[PDB]
Design a protein around this nucleic acid. Structure first.
Ligand SMILES: [Mg+2]
Ligand SMILES: [Mg+2]
Ligand SMILES: [Mg+2]
Ligand SMILES: [Mg+2]
Ligand SMILES: [Mg+2]
Ligand SMILES: [Mg+2]
Ligand SMILES: [Mg+2]
Ligand SMILES: [Mg+2]
Ligand SMILES: [Mg+2]
Ligand SMILES: [Mg+2]
Ligand SMILES: [Mg+2]
Ligand SMILES: [Mg+2]
Ligand SMILES: [Mg+2]
Ligand SMILES: [Mg+2]
Ligand SMILES: [Mg+2]
Ligand SMILES: [Mg+2]
Ligand SMILES: [Mg+2]
Ligand SMILES: [Mg+2]
Ligand SMILES: [Mg+2]
Ligand SMILES: [Mg+2]
Ligand SMILES: [Mg+2]
Ligand SMILES: [Mg+2]
Ligand SMILES: [Mg+2]
Ligand SMILES: [Mg+2]
Ligand SMILES: [Mg+2]
Ligand SMILES: [Mg+2]
Ligand SMILES: [Mg+2]
Ligand SMILES: [Mg+2]
Ligand SMILES: [Mg+2]
Ligand SMILES: [Mg+2]
Ligand SMILES: [Mg+2]
Ligand SMILES: [Mg+2]
Ligand SMILES: [Mg+2]
Ligand SMILES: [Mg+2]
Ligand SMILES: [Mg+2]
Ligand SMILES: [Mg+2]
Ligand SMILES: [Mg+2]
Ligand SMILES: [Mg+2]
Ligand SMILES: [Mg+2]
Ligand SMILES: [Mg+2]
Ligand SMILES: [Mg+2]
Ligand SMILES: [Mg+2]
Ligand SMILES: [Mg+2]
Ligand SMILES: [Mg+2]
Ligand SMILES: [Mg+2]
Ligand SMILES: [Mg+2]
Ligand SMILES: [Mg+2]
Ligand SMILES: [Mg+2]
Ligand SMILES: [Mg+2]
Ligand SMILES: [Mg+2]
Ligand SMILES: [Mg+2]
Ligand SMILES: [Mg+2]
Ligand SMILES: [Mg+2]
Ligand SMILES: [Mg+2]
Ligand SMILES: [Mg+2]
Ligand SMILES: [Mg+2]
Ligand SMILES: [Mg+2]
Ligand SMILES: [Mg+2]
Ligand SMILES: [Mg+2]
Ligand SMILES: [Mg+2]
Ligand SMILES: [Mg+2]
Ligand SMILES: [Mg+2]
Ligand SMILES: [Mg+2]
Ligand SMILES: [Mg+2]
Ligand SMILES: [Mg+2]
Ligand SMILES: [Mg+2]
Ligand SMILES: [Mg+2]
Ligand SMILES: [Mg+2]
Ligand SMILES: [Mg+2]
Ligand SMILES: [Mg+2]
Ligand SMILES: [Mg+2]
Ligand SMILES: [Mg+2]
Ligand SMILES: [Mg+2]
Ligand SMILES: [Mg+2]
Ligand SMILES: [Mg+2]
Ligand SMILES: [Mg+2]
Ligand SMILES: [Mg+2]
Ligand SMILES: [Mg+2]
Ligand SMILES: [Mg+2]
Ligand SMILES: [Mg+2]
Lengths: 94, 39, 46
RNA sequence: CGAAGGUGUGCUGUGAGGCAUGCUGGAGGUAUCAGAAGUGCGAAUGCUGACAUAAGUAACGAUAAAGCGGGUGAAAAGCCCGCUCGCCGGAAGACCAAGGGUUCCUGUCCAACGUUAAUCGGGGCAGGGUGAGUCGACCCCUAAGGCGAGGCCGAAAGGCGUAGUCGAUGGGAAACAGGUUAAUAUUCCUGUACUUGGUGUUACUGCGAAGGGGGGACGGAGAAGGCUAUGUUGGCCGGGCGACGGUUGUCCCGGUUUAAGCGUGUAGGCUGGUUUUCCAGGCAAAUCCGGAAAAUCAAGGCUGAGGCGUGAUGACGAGGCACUACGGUGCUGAAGCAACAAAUGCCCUGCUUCCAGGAAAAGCCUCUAAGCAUCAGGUAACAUCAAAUCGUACCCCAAACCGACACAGGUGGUCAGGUAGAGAAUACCAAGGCGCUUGAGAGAACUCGGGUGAAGGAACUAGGCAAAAUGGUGCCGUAACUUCGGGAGAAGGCACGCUGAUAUGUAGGUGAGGUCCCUCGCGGAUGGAGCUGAAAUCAGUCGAAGAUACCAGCUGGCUGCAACU
RNA sequence: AGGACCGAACCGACUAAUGUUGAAAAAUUAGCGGAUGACUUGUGGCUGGGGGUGAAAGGCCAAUCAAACCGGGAGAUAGCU
RNA sequence: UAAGGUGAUAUGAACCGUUAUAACCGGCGAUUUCCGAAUGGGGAAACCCAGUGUGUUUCGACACACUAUCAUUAACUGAAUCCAUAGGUUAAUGAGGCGAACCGGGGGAACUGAAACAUCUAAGUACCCCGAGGAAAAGAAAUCAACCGAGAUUCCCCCAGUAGCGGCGAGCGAACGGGGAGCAGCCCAGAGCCUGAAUCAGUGUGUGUGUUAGUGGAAGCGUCUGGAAAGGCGCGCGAUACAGGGUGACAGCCCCGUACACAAAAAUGCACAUGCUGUGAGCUCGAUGAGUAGGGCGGGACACGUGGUAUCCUGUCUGAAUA
């Protein structure tokens, strides 16, 4: 049983995108920005508890951070993690 | 383009550290050009 | 022509890396020198 | 009410200098007399920075090549669209590893970088983008080798090394086809599968290792045979009937695709099986292996490409039918067969043969030891659950890697179409990708790289340097010498195209229908349809020339040295 | 069968010309040698400086070798410029 | 302590606070991911893989703790081999690593100079290694002296560039003694007698003095020039404060401060004082550091290069007496 505190610290934000809108309307899959240490079971438990929705499968990928130059100073953004959460059919979410 | 000082996605507005593409920032890049040029 | 640097990260880290430096006495003296000079990148190792 | 400093002027002293003042500047300076010095620069092929010169000169990075129209735009040789042209095509195409690390896609900008302009970009800025039980890593296993408890040794540091533990470049479970995105896909979707672990039920009941055995498990070369990838042709289906003579046909174009898996077990390879008894061996044991016997049966077993069936009433499919933001999106969908040729790929970790005599360990299978004794555990079915984590964009013979460059260099692996050809050479093309980021003219010397050359033909020159020439297949023929192999492709020479006949396509290869037999099948004969198809002879015929292009030995004689590779 | 033959890939580097502030701090073009072997190549590993390695040229050891590089002794010494 | 704040480039947004849990400063605390001595095993640093145990479970599995090595001690166990021992295992305590210089020790150069160079010098230098502390080291005469006497060690000034050493070359270079800084002496090798008696260490308490935030802190106006007065000209005032800094030009009197006066809930140093714990004090009678001193050989250190060379150290072979 995954603890509710970790499940509350797993999910960061929904990821808005054209690809995310496509997966939401066609494959019934939401795209979430999650915590970096989060696994697939922790994500599935969080969506199944905190959203009250039936999760079929979770696909994950790690996004490498870009290297930027603010002014003339070089810098690098953070690596973040992206989850494709396929809901079961009939389930709906805002 | 201004890098985002911070952007209110409430209505999609807010302030932006005006990197602006900042040819001025890229003017510092040209100063770097002279520097690594000297190197 | 074939130039003298043909990179390989595995051989780079086995030869010049952190744990290879920390293994021996003289390699530990290298890290003490780079810390005293105040190097940002103390070794190769990313 | 204008300091230092800067810039002028005037005056003054023998000189280093001094004074006054105009302008700039806009806040510090300092008499005198003493004191202390980082105390005076033109040179040191002096150090650092700035600016000159040559000079608006050389060059603008492969001699693969561009031309036009339209568009956008402030502006177009370079961008986009289009029509032509040219280049690669065993690569200048496609997939990767290594390495790099967002260079990917979209919008926007043109200062800088782009050896020119730039509206473009691998440039700037912002956003988006990498989806795995089966791919890879991690992981299990070990090689070379490293570390190394104890240990041995050593002035100290430390060296070596046992048990061990790391260490791939090697061994170890499993997924395919189609579709889709601006950008990912064996990762998403659809369809159809597969693997390993769990727990749980039910039946069955010897389980058990850090140990024993087997297996994994291994060389080079060579020879064929069977296949397939793939290609060609025919058939089939759809469309066409030709800008200029002809073309309803022995005509033209295009398509004719289909997987993993499951079932069958084939060509073919290896092998004698089976039962019982006994046993100084395998650290102890052993039902296992090994070894002795006896009996019975010749026929059981292992491996195995491909094919066939299913997967698949599907998917795909030329084209059409419609809307259209001209990008596209939706719908529908014919035929989907056969023969021949054929790999360097597969059977093949095979077979034959040779000497130089060709990894390990685990996984996997089996045997028992202690142990457990009806419990544990074991395999069998079914159900259920799980299979995490990391990588996945992009380049990858290159503008993104190593070369300071958007550098004519270097860089491992995989795929390997057509015609000719022995061929992965070479020539022209396909798929696909490019025209190498300065152009426009002119048509001097000279230089570079090539083409041809009267007569002569090495007279050039240190020297035939370089060029030129020879060049192929088949047959004839071929010297001294010799270590008897060679020399030798010696030298030298003849033929070579096309058409017709032999033979409306031969010999040969392939092999159907059909028929018969059978211990019955992926069977054995017979049978020759159809396809493919050299080579030769004879006759004719064209040109100056038939190995017509690319490709592709100059030869011989004497001699020094070193045996040779 | 072959340290066999001809000849592409691959490895090499005999000759000439170009170039020599190069396209390139050793290359291009046309030819050239080997090409089943004493072959070649990828990955990883080992040998360390008076030391390694070397089919041996004093060759190679990161564009550096009759004794690498870096730091230090060190402001070596310099009757020399 | 406070009326203003939410660190900076760096605005802005959304907010907090104004008489006291806004903020700020300080004390004690809490949290303190991962690597790293890194310590559960591994490892290409910031990564991979676990085991045991105790808990939870919505049976999917979660959470927490522990598990390195070595030294020492103790317990249990335990070979060949009877006992034994080696070995094994548990447990407890400790260590490990870093860091500027100074210090002690183990090793230990060369260039150079000698106008060459080999003895010598450079130089016990650089360097490497080991170990420690806030300092270390040394240290309480088997010492000097000179027939007078001194009285541990260390440091400074002289002695003195002397005496000497030395291819008697280059160069190296004391001591005795004197003036100063600072001063402190003890114990075991052993019994008794009286017995806990001094001192020290530890731990408390108490007082003082600091430290780690802080509080108060004097006294000037007018006019002129000027963008602006702190400048000029007047007239005052403060000073145990005319140190310094800032403010639109040069400010004792604008500001922050300064002199001076104070201040700590809490933590801590140092002093004293004392409690407690441990420690023994004094007296008597004794004893008085053997493979050692010394020697032979070879080296080294002493200013002293083996010289006529004392003394010290010892690799090797030996080897006394003992108040
Ligand atoms: Mg999935
Ligand atoms: Mg003026
Ligand atoms: Mg001055
Ligand atoms: Mg002036
Ligand atoms: Mg002046
Ligand atoms: Mg000058
Ligand atoms: Mg001069
Ligand atoms: Mg000069
Ligand atoms: Mg000029
Ligand atoms: Mg000129
Ligand atoms: Mg000219
Ligand atoms: Mg020119
Ligand atoms: Mg160009
Ligand atoms: Mg050019
Ligand atoms: Mg045009
Ligand atoms: Mg062009
Ligand atoms: Mg075009
Ligand atoms: Mg072509
Ligand atoms: Mg970029
Ligand atoms: Mg692009
Ligand atoms: Mg864009
Ligand atoms: Mg422009
Ligand atoms: Mg430009
Ligand atoms: Mg870009
Ligand atoms: Mg993944
Ligand atoms: Mg795999
Ligand atoms: Mg594995
Ligand atoms: Mg080993
Ligand atoms: Mg070792
Ligand atoms: Mg050891
Ligand atoms: Mg290991
Ligand atoms: Mg291992
Ligand atoms: Mg591997
Ligand atoms: Mg792509
Ligand atoms: Mg075995
Ligand atoms: Mg076929
Ligand atoms: Mg026509
Ligand atoms: Mg016509
Ligand atoms: Mg056709
Ligand atoms: Mg099939
Ligand atoms: Mg890709
Ligand atoms: Mg390419
Ligand atoms: Mg270019
Ligand atoms: Mg290139
Ligand atoms: Mg081809
Ligand atoms: Mg070719
Ligand atoms: Mg010309
Ligand atoms: Mg010619
Ligand atoms: Mg002629
Ligand atoms: Mg002629
Ligand atoms: Mg002549
Ligand atoms: Mg002649
Ligand atoms: Mg020639
Ligand atoms: Mg020629
Ligand atoms: Mg001669
Ligand atoms: Mg020879
Ligand atoms: Mg050969
Ligand atoms: Mg060549
Ligand atoms: Mg050859
Ligand atoms: Mg020689
Ligand atoms: Mg070199
Ligand atoms: Mg050396
Ligand atoms: Mg030397
Ligand atoms: Mg020196
Ligand atoms: Mg010098
Ligand atoms: Mg702030
Ligand atoms: Mg660990
Ligand atoms: Mg470790
Ligand atoms: Mg010398
Ligand atoms: Mg010397
Ligand atoms: Mg000398
Ligand atoms: Mg002491
Ligand atoms: Mg105050
Ligand atoms: Mg005041
Ligand atoms: Mg001013
Ligand atoms: Mg004594
Ligand atoms: Mg002695
Ligand atoms: Mg003596
Ligand atoms: Mg002696
Ligand atoms: Mg002795």
């Amino acid at each position: 049983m995954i603890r509710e505190e970790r499940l509350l610290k797993v999910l960061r934000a929904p990821h808005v995108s054209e690809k995310a809108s496509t997966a939401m309307e066609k494959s019934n899959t939401i795209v979430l920005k999650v915590a970096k240490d989060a696994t697939k079971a922790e994500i599935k438990a969080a969506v199944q508890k905190l959203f009250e929705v039936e999760v079929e499968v979770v696909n994950t990928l790690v996004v490498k951070g870009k290297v930027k130059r603010h002014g003339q100073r070089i810098g690098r953004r953070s690596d973040w993690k992206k989850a494709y959460v396929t809901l079961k059919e009939g389930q709906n979410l805002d | 383009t201004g890098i985002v000082k911070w952007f209110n996605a409430d209505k999609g507005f807010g302030f932006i550290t005006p990197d602006d593409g900042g040819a001025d920032v890229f003017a510092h890049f040209s100063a770097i050009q002279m520097s690594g040029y000297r190197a | 022509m074939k130039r003298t640097f043909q990179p390989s990260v595995l051989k780079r880290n086995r030869s010049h890396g952190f744990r290879a430096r920390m293994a021996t006495k003289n390699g530990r003296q290298v890290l003490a020198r780079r810390r005293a000079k105040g190097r940002a990148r103390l070794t190769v190792s990313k």
